[PDB]
């Protein structure tokens, strides 16, 4: 029952601009290059509009082939700032974000409706996290995985929706499972 992983996207091993598409273009999701604890650059996406009303900030990947996989796995590493560490008494601060996908045969889609995106889940910090010493503090780099299928189009677009969190997406790894090959 051991399956190999076929990696479709590994954002953390992209060097230079990820070039994902943010809606709005400014004042929502921003690409931010940071150094990890080993001084290795990571392209992150961040937003923290917690002094505003509830948000609707979208970020999407370009098209990802599914290579005729029935099911795809999406692993997100992320860090967030706790709402109880931020000002305001409007009750709008969240510690979650929303994950979506849009299956398409078209590898050059633009200006897509919100209602073409299918919600995968609300993503929250849970038990799975790496502890990273950031000076005197222990940062939780949270790891969450979800899967989708049965897939039926040539590929898909992933999207991330911020509704009012202080959130940084650090890694997006997308893969499917494949039986090991026979070594002729």
């Amino acid at each position: 029952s051991h399956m190999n992983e076929v990696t479709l996207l590994d954002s953390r091993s992209v060097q230079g601009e990820l070039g994902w598409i943010a809606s709005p273009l400014e004042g929502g999701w921003e690409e931010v290059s940071i150094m990890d604890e080993k001084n290795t650059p990571i392209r992150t996406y961040q937003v923290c509009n917690v002094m505003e009303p509830s948000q609707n900030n979208w970020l999407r990947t370009d098209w990802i082939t599914r290579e005729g996989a029935q099911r795809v796995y999406i692993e997100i590493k992320f860090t967030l700032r706790d709402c109880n560490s931020l000002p305001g008494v409007m009750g709008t601060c969240k510690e979650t974000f929303n994950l979506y996908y849009y299956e398409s045969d078209n590898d050059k889609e633009r200006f897509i409706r919100e209602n073409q995106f299918v919600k995968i889940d609300t993503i929250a910090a849970d038990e799975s996290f790496t502890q990273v010493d950031i000076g005197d503090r222990i940062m939780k780099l949270n790891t969450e995985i979800r899967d989708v299928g049965p897939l039926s189009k040539k590929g898909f677009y992933l999207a991330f929706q911020d509704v009012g969190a202080c959130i940084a997406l650090v890694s997006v790894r997308v893969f499917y499972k494949k039986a090991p090959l026979t070594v002729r």
């Binding site: 931010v32 940071i34 150094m35 990571i42 992150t44 961040q46 923290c48 202080c166 940084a168």
Partner: peptide
């Protein structure tokens, strides 16, 4: 906001 996250500086690495």
């Amino acid at each position: 906001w996250f500086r690495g």
